């Protein structure tokens, strides 16, 4: 620890910052070439990251604090090019040469003037003081002060220039920092920032497009209903502007469909459609445009260059679905799926688990033997007299010949092939729910097709028939993927007629709701007329607010305008039981983001209140509710509801927590995880037949498991506890729910990463239906069969002009690189390198490979896949 | 920028979380307790249900009955035997001899039976997850993976196929040859669904006498209690050479449990829904009355495969891991004289090593000759194949 | 506190006040070899030095042993004929520093209190460093696997000192070479027939505590046995 | 803890923030919740209390359990402590999760019901072999050869600690490895220092001790101390001398053969389980390894497969360095004259020669270590 004879900084650097006002002071000469001597000293012997105990960096702070404090702030007239070295050699050291509490205080020394990254050319590491402008000056500067004084006008171009500084200083993680100088810069008026900086990011570079991509999309994912309103459309033309792949524009602007601006999105449709160079592009984005993200679509792409561009529509209509019934066909035919059955024989061993077997002969067993026949045919399994569990018991349960016909649909699942063939054989029967099932299988079938199979060609033959009930459910569920307004003007006086048969007039804003997305409110008019007519004298059975209600949110989700809630919130203020249909549309709007603000009003406005029986209905929506908001949270919610739910209410209810916080997770998800999935067992290997059991006794989900284990080990201590006379339908229906196809699972509106494709019309009705019993044996066997019928399920696939090539294919885990080193690494899982066109893969992104460059997507689960191998 | 305030908005907020968990409950982790926000379940009905209304209905075992009149004779485990009745609350019926039931510790009345015995140590064998291997990886067995797939799962999968025509489908199939008959077994061990078990036989080496007869006995219970079960059986040459016997009484504790086993199988009332395969290393002294027609009926063999499976393994092998794009794997078999797939991945592993050795990814041809040089002349001279080339 | 034998009420079962053992003693019991000390010692001098010098000294001196950075030894090996101080010097070496004088016949009598199976005989270090003042011995060929079994665990695995061994045998040409490593083993020792002045000094040692006649004559005596033994 | 793990950017910007107050968001209503419901509804304190009843309900005299069978109906059958069983029942509390064959569960005293379970005092076995500290240095203080050294760093410890490279190569990692060589070249040594270096589960047991003078034993033993090994953790076992059982027998094994036999080849089947091999990689150490038996040394069931040679003369003065870096020595030190005394020494003789010229110095209490100390050395350690 030797001091002394080389230490040059206790003489020279020592004396000289010392006796600084000593030599500056009516010095002109000896003040600025000894100064410059300083810059030189400080910038010459510390840019080598070698000695950072600088003899100088940790010397010429001791003494030259007050000292510089005496140079800079107190001397006033820093001249031209004095100063030039002032804030160069005053400024390495400025970190250093103050504590910790730089944060306020990177101005006195550099704010005075902006020195002209010059001492900066050979080491790396004041935009923390343009940081600090933005964040507290500008923000107490134009808070609500838009327009002001230099502290703007000086500090945008500032904000611009430090902003090109940014990947023009080290081209390292400083890249990053624009978002965190453009967004927390003016927060609410983003727009007025990234108009200036996406000009900027068009002549930058074409490399770095994707870092900032997936960083402002978690910014976007969640985000306040300004920043969702301008940053998206902000982050969203990179493509359009600053790019020139433009492909980016399906499934990542969709989200500025239904929340930024309703004609926004066909007018990137029309972007799409103005440059439609070549083939593929084109073909990518439009083909999620119609079965895979949203409708309306298949009469959209008809106009004047109809040959096979334009003619593209009928393909995106009906003849991509007919591309994949063509893969379930013979890819199917291939790998496992025969047409049908083993399930009986796997409960065989009930018969010899402990004793004497042969005891258990359950009636209700028949819902779960149409479904025997519905699940396990599900996805192109087609049959011939393997309905016999649909016939039998078809024509033996007066309301289970509608399952018996319903499960015929689940047979020919979304299939366009031989509906008006195999549904003719059992149609001319004249038992109201054989012929309800049938010409509901009608609607079931082409569902999604929504060609020429029932606009009125099919369930008109039974709506001349108003039986009555179902000739709306699959005559509007074809039309689930329209939204012609044909259909709504031919049964919008079902509603209209006010029917003195609730049965139906309840489902009515279901039916004709889903149909529509938007405007038009002569719906939701005429539905809360009929509910203040009707709804409003009576307090009793729920039927009015489990049917009438959900039209009205089902034609207004998806809009964090706030515009619907002075509408509809206004319009059905009315009595508590009532009240129930206020603030449903209040919160369909909110699918994928963040705002707890609006979270802590669901348990706000009635957390318990001790509910003596009194708002149990109220608060059980409520819960409902707070199912949403959560169903996307690109990782951020996930747990925080699994946890908060699992804590409160679950565990502290009365009749919310030991009835309705289950149906949480059966709404959020079908992935497939010990978190939650094992959860519901806890409350399920406990049937408390206390409360309800039917609602701990009311598997929703798809992805087959292997949770098979302790499902048949309950029903071996199922042989003589657990009775089934309702239970049977319950056992066998759970059992074959999941795994209906080993496919045909991708429903959890994850898509291109987690873009909707809903999926929520369809299928609502059904999880909000189970409230609470007196449904489960008669008045539940309209939905508990085929309710939702939203599945686009595969995505590893080549679908070129001619499938020649297999595939390159390389399927990989969910990606977590944020800000890492060039390149980024993509995922882990590239252990398994083959060339299958396999599942879709519900934590899955594919990685290509084999020189295809993959100039189709490089982010829309149908990679087309152009090819060229310039790299030779 | 705000690095402390963010990192204590943190932690601050997670002790926050740690303390208002406590405030639920997690602490006090117990010996058996269940998890403390959950249990509240049994609280006060259920307490004083599982309890005061339910009494325990000690384990009994029958002895015989007599018709007209209830008079069994019970048997328990310390106490003596007795005269007793069962309660009318049952069906008086399936109480019959050889059976296990429960019986009131006070009124000594039977309430009702339960399970045959379980001797955990067998229940130690019920697999119960099918692995993740494939037919399709396992190429070669051309004309042996349908051999076996016939006598392996068609009459389940078509038990109507082969009884129209009125005749038995076969019953035993064996393995013999790292030619991969384990590899084989578990491709065939997964993709079935029945109930599947397999036993270790070395595992019934005991200490005392009889006993792993009486275990394989229980074994051979809970399956015909089974009703659509296969049984795979590992390396049975411990299981009994023969018995070749002399002077001396030595192994025959081996060939008692050997007979015990062999009766299983043929006449008097014999399994049902039951067949088998097992394997060995050396067949060479294999029992003849295994060998016995309606106990061994197939002979399906593991061979050196040719060049063709050899070549068809190379591109399994290989085809997950950075390569030349345009090797001619023929050579690579073309230098396989003798050799098993395992060997074939070895080598590909060995090659990966040297290409990881210095700095590369994608493998060379050069990678594959260092590979196979190493791998085949200076990995000969053991190399493990002569002794069972002769199977002796 | 473990192997606390206790009073508790009957009544509710209730731990109520406070009573055994430590199960090496009762080992030495069912052994009851011939404790003995330096004072019975016919004619084994140099062998006194070595042994002392082997055993003490790593003991007391742990800063020794490493002033001469030396890598500390670990067992001792003898030989000789039948009965010649082979047993009676190692009780003695044991007694002089307080080594808890343990032994192990391979035998089963004495197994019940180690392990309850105890397939192996290593359970025997659960109790080795327990008390570490200790010392096992190894008898006269399983003895020899054993002795493996041990040495070859302490062998920088178990880092635990004062844990000292001999195994016992003659005509040590006749044993495995896994017990010839040349840095297995560190050291052997020499025990020779009886001799003149070693004949006589035992004679002398095992008359003592006899009332005699006046006059001796240990002279002639000694001119007498022919080195049968010193038994 | 264990909230979410997305934490990302790692950096200042508004990602982690955004999550942390979110979570301290949903953390605050779920915590008001749990005050809000003793608020009006406090019915019982339930810290202690929904706990004071389950001790007044869980029998005062905790009677030792021993599972034996599962009817998860809450009510299934327990044993005694010599065996008078019954069918007693299972309440919510008990947490019915780890219900296994063979437990040490909670009974009550009156209908015996289960009061809950214990945890496992263990073991009386594992901790024979379960690992205590770095025995020993690093394989630097080793030497000699440093290249199959080298292959063996590479094959076991690269592994673990980039679990990266071969995924790049998209490749597992081998999975066996062995020595071998004359006796007394370094075999235990090195895996000593491969110890040392390590930050995983370790073990350690010889060949020799598996037969057992019963039957059918020993072979139990290996299975169910794979069992352990595969159960605990990353875990690299070693067993030294495997043909110590191929190559002695023992009088006091019962058998001969005829239980070697069964023992090692269901052993080998243990390395080359059907089901799910786990995380378990293992090295092999024996002097004579050409007559065991061949089967083990099938490819698969070990992969790494390094010789160990005589170590050169050149490399025997750098052994002697080793052996007389820190001790006192006499400046007379002519290493070489006593190197090539042996033509084929081994690396044991060095220290050998050291610690006995050392013992030498200490009976005269000198402290230089001079030549003719090394004479005697070389007299004494060798010429028997
Ligand atoms: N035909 C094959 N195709 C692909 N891999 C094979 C083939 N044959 C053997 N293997 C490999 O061999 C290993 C498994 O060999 P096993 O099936 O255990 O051998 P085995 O013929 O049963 O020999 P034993 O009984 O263990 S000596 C795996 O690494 C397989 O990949
Ligand atoms: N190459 C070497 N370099 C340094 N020291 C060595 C070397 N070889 C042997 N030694 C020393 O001698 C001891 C013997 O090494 P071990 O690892 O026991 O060899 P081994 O070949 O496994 O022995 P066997 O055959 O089981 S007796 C080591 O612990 C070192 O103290
Ligand atoms: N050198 C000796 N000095 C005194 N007594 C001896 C000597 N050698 C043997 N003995 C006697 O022999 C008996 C013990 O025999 P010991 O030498 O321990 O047997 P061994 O060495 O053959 O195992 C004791 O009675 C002991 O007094
Ligand atoms: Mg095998
Ligand atoms: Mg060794």
């Known amino acids: 620890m030797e001091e002394g004879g080389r230490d040059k900084a206790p003489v020279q650097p020592q004396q000289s910052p010392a006796a600084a006002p000593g030599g500056t002071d009516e010095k002109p000469s000896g003040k600025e070439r000894r100064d410059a001597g300083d810059k030189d000293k400080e910038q010459e012997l510390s840019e080598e990251d070698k000695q950072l105990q600088d003899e100088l960096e940790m010397l010429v702070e001791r003494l030259g604090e007050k000292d510089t404090s005496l140079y800079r702030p107190a001397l006033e007239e820093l001249r031209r090019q004095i100063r030039s070295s002032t804030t160069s050699m005053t400024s390495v050291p400025k970190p250093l040469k103050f504590l910790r509490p730089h944060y306020g205080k990177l101005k006195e020394i550099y704010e005075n003037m902006a020195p002209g990254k010059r001492f900066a050319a050979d080491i790396i590491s004041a935009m923390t003081m343009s940081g600090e402008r933005e964040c507290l000056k500008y923000r107490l500067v134009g808070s609500q002060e838009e327009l002001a004084s230099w502290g703007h006008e000086y500090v945008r171009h500032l904000a611009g220039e430090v902003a090109k500084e940014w990947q023009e200083l080290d081209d390292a993680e400083k890249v990053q920092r624009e978002p965190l100088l453009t967004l927390v810069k003016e927060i609410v008026p983003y727009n007025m920032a990234h108009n200036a900086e996406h000009e900027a990011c068009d002549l930058l570079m074409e490399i770095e497009q994707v870092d900032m991509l997936e960083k402002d999309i978690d910014e976007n994912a969640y985000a306040k209903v300004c920043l969702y309103l301008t940053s998206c459309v902000n982050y969203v033309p990179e493509p359009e502007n600053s790019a020139l792949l433009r492909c980016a524009l399906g499934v990542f602007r969709k989200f500025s469909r239904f929340p930024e601006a309703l004609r926004l999105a066909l007018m990137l449709n029309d972007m799409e459609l103005v440059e439609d160079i070549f083939t593929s592009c084109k073909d990518v984005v439009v083909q999620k445009q119609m079965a895979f993200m949203l409708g309306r679509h298949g009469v959209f792409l008809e106009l004047s260059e109809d040959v096979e561009e334009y003619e593209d529509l009928t393909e995106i209509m009906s003849n991509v679905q007919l591309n994949s019934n063509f893969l379930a066909l013979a890819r199917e035919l291939d790998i496992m799926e025969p047409k049908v059955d083993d399930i009986y024989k796997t409960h065989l061993e009930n018969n010899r688990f402990g004793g004497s077997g042969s005891q258990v002969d359950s009636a209700r067993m028949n819902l779960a033997s149409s479904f025997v026949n519905g699940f396990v045919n599900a996805a192109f399994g087609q049959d011939k007299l393997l309905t016999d569990d649909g016939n039998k018991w078809l024509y033996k349960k007066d309301h289970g010949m509608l399952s018996a016909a319903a499960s015929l649909g689940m047979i020919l699942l979304w299939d366009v092939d031989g509906g008006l063939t195999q549904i003719d054989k059992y149609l001319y029967s004249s038992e109201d729910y054989i012929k309800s099932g049938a010409l509901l299988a009608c609607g079931i079938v082409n569902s999604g097709v929504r060609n020429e199979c029932d606009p009125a060609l099919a369930l008109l033959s039974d709506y001349v028939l108003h039986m009555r009930l179902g000739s709306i459910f699959g005559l509007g569920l074809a039309y689930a993927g329209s939204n012609r307004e044909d259909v709504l003007t031919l049964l919008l006086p079902v509603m209209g007629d006010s029917k003195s048969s609730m049965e139906v007039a309840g489902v009515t804003a279901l039916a004709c709701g889903m149909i529509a997305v938007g405007s038009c409110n002569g719906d939701v008019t005429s539905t809360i007329l009929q509910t203040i007519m009707e709804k409003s004298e009576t307090e009793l059975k729920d039927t009015y607010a489990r049917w009438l209600p959900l039209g009205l949110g089902l034609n207004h989700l998806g809009k964090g305008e706030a515009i619907e809630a002075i509408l509809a919130a206004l319009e059905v203020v009315s009595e508590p039981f009532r009240s129930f249909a206020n603030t449903l549309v209040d919160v369909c709007a909110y699918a994928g983001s963040g705002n707890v603000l609006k979270v802590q009003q669901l348990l706000h406005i009635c957390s318990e209140h001790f509910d003596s029986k009194e708002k149990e209905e109220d608060k059980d929506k409520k819960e409902k509710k707070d199912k949403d908001k959560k169903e996307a949270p690109a990782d951020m919610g996930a747990h925080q509801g699994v946890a908060v739910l699992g804590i409160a209410l679950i565990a502290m209810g009365e009749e919310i927590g030991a009835e309705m916080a289950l149906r949480t997770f059966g709404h959020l998800l079908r992935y497939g995880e010990p978190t939650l999935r094992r959860a519901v067992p806890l409350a399920l290997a406990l049937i408390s037949v206390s409360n309800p059991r039917l609602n701990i006794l009311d598997s929703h989900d798809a992805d087959p498991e292997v949770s098979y284990n302790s499902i048949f080990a309950m029903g071996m201590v199922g042989s003589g506890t657990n009775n089934a006379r309702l239970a049977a339908m319950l056992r066998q229906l759970a059992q074959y729910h999941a795994k209906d196809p080993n496919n045909l699972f991708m429903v959890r509106l994850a898509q291109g990463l987690t873009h909707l494709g809903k999926g929520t019309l369809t299928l609502c009705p059904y999880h909000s239906d189970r409230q609470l019993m007196s449904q489960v044996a008669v008045a539940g066997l309209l939905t508990v069969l085929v309710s939702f019928l939203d599945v686009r399920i595969i995505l590893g696939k080549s679908h070129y002009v001619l499938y020649g090539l297999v595939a390159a294919m390389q399927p990989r885990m969910l990606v977590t690189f944020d800000e890492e080193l060039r390149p980024l690494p993509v995922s882990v899982r590239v252990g398994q390198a083959v060339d299958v066109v396999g599942q879709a893969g519900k934590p899955k992104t594919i990685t290509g490979f084999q020189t295809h460059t993959t100039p189709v997507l490089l982010a829309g689960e149908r990679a087309e896949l152009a090819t060229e191998e310039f790299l030779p | 920028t705000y690095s402390r305030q963010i990192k204590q908005v943190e932690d601050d907020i997670q002790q926050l979380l740690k303390k208002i968990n406590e405030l639920t409950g997690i602490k006090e982790s117990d010996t058996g307790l269940a998890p403390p926000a959950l249990w509240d379940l049994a609280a006060d009905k259920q307490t004083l249900q599982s309890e005061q209304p339910l009494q325990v209905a000690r384990c009994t075992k029958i002895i015989n009955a007599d018709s007209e009149d209830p008079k069994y004779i019970i048997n328990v485990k310390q106490f003596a035997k007795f005269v007793v009745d069962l309660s009318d609350q049952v069906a008086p019926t399936d109480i019959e001899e050889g059976m296990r039931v429960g019986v009131d510790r006070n009124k000594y009345q039977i309430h009702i039976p339960l399970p045959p015995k379980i001797d955990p140590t067998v229940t130690m064998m019920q697999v119960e997850e099918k692995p993740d291997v494939t037919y399709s990886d396992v190429g070669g067995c051309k004309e042996q993976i349908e051999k076996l797939r016939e006598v392996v799962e068609t009459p389940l999968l078509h038990p109507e196929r082969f009884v129209n025509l009125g005749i038995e489908p076969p019953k035993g199939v064996l393995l013999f040859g790292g030619t991969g008959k384990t590899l084989c077994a578990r491709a065939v061990a997964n993709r079935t669904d029945a109930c599947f078990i397999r036993v270790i036989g070395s595992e019934l080496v005991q200490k005392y006498v009889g006993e792993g007869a009486r275990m394989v006995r229980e074994l051979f219970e809970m399956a015909r209690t089974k009703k659509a079960c296969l049984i795979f059986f590992d390396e049975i040459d411990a299981i009994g050479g023969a018995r070749f016997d002399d002077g001396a009484g030595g192994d025959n504790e081996v060939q008692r449990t050997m007979l015990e086993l062999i009766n299983q199988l043929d006449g008097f009332d014999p399994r049902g829904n039951i067949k088998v395969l097992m394997a060995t290393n050396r067949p060479d002294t294999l029992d003849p009355a295994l060998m016995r027609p309606g106990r061994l009926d197939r002979k399906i063999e593991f061979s050196l495969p040719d060049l063709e499976g050899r070549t068809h393994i190379f591109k399994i092998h290989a085809r997950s891991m950075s390569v030349e794009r345009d090797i001619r794997f023929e050579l690579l078999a073309r230098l396989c004289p003798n050799s098993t797939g395992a060997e074939i991945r070895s080598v590909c592993t060995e090659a990966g090593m040297f290409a990881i050795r210095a700095r590369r990814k994608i493998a060379t041809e050069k990678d594959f000759l260092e590979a196979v040089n190493k791998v085949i002349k200076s990995y000969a001279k053991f190399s493990a194949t002569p002794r069972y080339m002769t199977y002796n | ?231 | 803890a264990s909230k979410l793990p997305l934490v990302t950017p790692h950096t200042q910007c508004r990602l982690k923030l955004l999550k942390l107050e979110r979570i301290k968001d949903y953390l605050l209503m779920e915590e008001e919740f749990i005050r809000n419901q003793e608020q009006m509804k406090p019915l019982e304190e339930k810290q202690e209390e929904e706990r004071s009843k389950v001790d007044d309900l869980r029998g005062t005299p905790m009677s030792v359990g021993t599972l034996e069978e599962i009817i998860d109906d809450n009510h299934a059958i327990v044993s005694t402590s010599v065996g008078s069983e019954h069918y007693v029942s299972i309440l919510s509390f008990v947490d019915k999760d780890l219900l296994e064959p063979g437990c040490s569960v909670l009974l009550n005293h009156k209908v015996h019901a289960v009061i809950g379970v214990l945890m496992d005092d263990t073991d009386p076995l594992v901790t024979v072999m379960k690992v205590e500290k770095a025995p020993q240095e690093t394989y630097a203080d080793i030497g000699g050869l440093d290249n199959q050294i080298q292959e063996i760093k590479e094959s076991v410890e690269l592994p673990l600690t980039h679990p990266e490279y071969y995924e790049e190569m998209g490749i597992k990692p081998p999975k066996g490895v062995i020595l071998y060589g004359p006796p007394g070249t370094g075999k235990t040594l090195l895996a000593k220092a491969v110890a040392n270096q390590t930050s995983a589960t370790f073990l350690r047991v010889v060949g020799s001790e598996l037969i057992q003078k019963y039957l059918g034993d020993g072979p139990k033993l290996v299975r169910e101390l794979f069992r352990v090994a595969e159960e605990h953790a990353p875990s690299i076992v070693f067993i030294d001398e495997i043909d110590a059982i191929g190559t002695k027998r023992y009088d006091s094994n019962s058998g001969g053969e005829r239980e070697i036999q069964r023992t090692m080849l269901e052993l080998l089947n243990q390395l080359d389980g059907f089901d799910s091999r786990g995380d378990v990689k293992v090295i092999m150490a024996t002097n004579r390894i050409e007559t065991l038996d061949p089967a083990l040394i099938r490819p698969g069931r070990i992969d790494r497969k390094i010789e160990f040679p005589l170590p050169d003369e050149k490399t025997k003065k750098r052994i002697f360095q080793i052996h007389t870096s820190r001790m006192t020595l006499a400046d007379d030190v002519t290493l070489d004259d006593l190197i090539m005394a042996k033509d084929d020494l081994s690396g044991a003789d060095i220290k050998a020669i050291c610690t006995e010229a050392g013992l030498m110095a200490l009976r005269e209490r000198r402290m230089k270590v001079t030549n003719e100390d090394f004479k005697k050395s070389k007299e004494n350690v060798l010429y028997k």
């Open chain 3, 1 to 231: 506190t473990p192997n606390c034998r206790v009073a508790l009420r009957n009544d509710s079962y209730t731990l109520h006040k406070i009573l055994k053992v430590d199960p090496l003693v009762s080992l030495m019991m069912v052994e009851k070899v011939p404790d003995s000390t330096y004072e019975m010692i016919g004619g084994l001098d140099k062998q006194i030095k070595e042994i002392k010098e082997v055993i003490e000294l790593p003991v007391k001196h742990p800063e020794l042993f490493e002033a001469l950075g030396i890598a500390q030894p670990k067992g001792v090996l003898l030989y000789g004929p039948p009965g010649t101080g082979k047993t009676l010097l190692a009780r003695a070496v044991a007694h002089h520093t307080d080594c808890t004088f343990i032994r192990v016949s391979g035998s089963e009598l004495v197994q019940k209190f180690i392990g309850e199976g105890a397939r192996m005989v290593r359970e025997l270090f659960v109790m080795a460093r327990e008390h570490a003042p200790s010392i096992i011995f190894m008898d006269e060929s399983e003895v020899q696997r054993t002795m493996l079994e041990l040495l070859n665990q302490l062998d920088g695995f178990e880092a635990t000192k004062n844990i000292k061994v001999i195994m016992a045998t003659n005509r040590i040409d006749i044993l495995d070479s896994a017990l010839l490593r040349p840095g297995r083993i560190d050291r052997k020792i020499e025990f020779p027939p009886p001799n003149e002045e070693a004949r006589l000094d035992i004679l002398k040692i095992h008359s003592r505590k006899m009332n005699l006649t006046r006059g001796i004559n240990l002279r002639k005596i000694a001119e007498l046995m022919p080195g049968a033994s010193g038994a």
